[PDB]
Task: inverse folding
């Protein structure tokens, strides 16, 4: 059974929210012809990725059992791809290279974001099941 | 324990939806390109339908006078919020680019902030039950 499942569930809820926010923001950036939009959203984007960095600092020590450790390792590998593609979409759009940004969005960012959210859901499912198994 | 836990989970989904909509609406307002209104419209409709579904799910689970008071206030604030959200997109579609930005700042964001504050208050009632 997962230990401290409720604490991890709350941290993953915030993490999921941050990913969902960043996906909405990056998608809007990629599809707008306004190259300056990435600059006008940059402080908000920095706040969202910092919030996840903080979640990671809190949650990593609490992820202990093999099933949740295996998922966390998978999340960290996909997150590397996700961050590289997010930053590339943003740089291309800032640089006026709109077609390349749109191509990167679909070819790289979207699959990485979808995998990131799917793995976060697998991680959450482990926690929720453990908590629901002790609730009574 | 199960009832406040289910409500906490629903409120966390609701909070995510509002947070996503605030980011999306902010991008629509600040983009000089008004085409985001149409290209993001189905994603925005899905985020707001998701919240409509959470509202239907959580209603039968409301048990306490303070929950009901907060939910009633959320319904009022959500009306103000939805009108302003929709107005940002209508202004962008109508070519009123500067007014879309000013309406974001002076109407949509304050309503969203009050909406999130109330969701936090509703969430804290569940945390109190779980502690």
Result:
């Amino acid at each position: 059974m997962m230990q401290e499942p409720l604490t991890k569930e709350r941290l993953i809820s915030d993490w999921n929210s941050n990913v969902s926010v960043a996906v909405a923001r990056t998608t809007a950036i990629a599809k707008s012809s306004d190259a300056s939009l990435v600059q006008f959203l940059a402080a908000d984007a920095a706040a969202t990725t910092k919030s996840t960095a903080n979640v990671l600092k809190q949650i990593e020590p609490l992820i202990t059992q093999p099933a949740e450790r295996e998922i966390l390792d998978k999340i960290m590998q996909v997150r590397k791809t996700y961050i590289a593609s997010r930053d590339k979409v943003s740089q291309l759009k800032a640089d006026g290279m709109a077609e390349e940004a749109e191509s990167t969005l679909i070819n790289s960012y979207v699959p990485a974001a979808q995998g990131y959210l799917k793995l976060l859901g697998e991680l959450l499912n482990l926690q929720r099941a453990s908590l629901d198994a002790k609730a009574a």
Q: What stands out?
A: Chain B has five helices and no strands. The radius of gyration of chain B is 16 Å. The domain at 2-130 of chain B is CATH 1.20.1440 (de novo design (two linked rop proteins)).
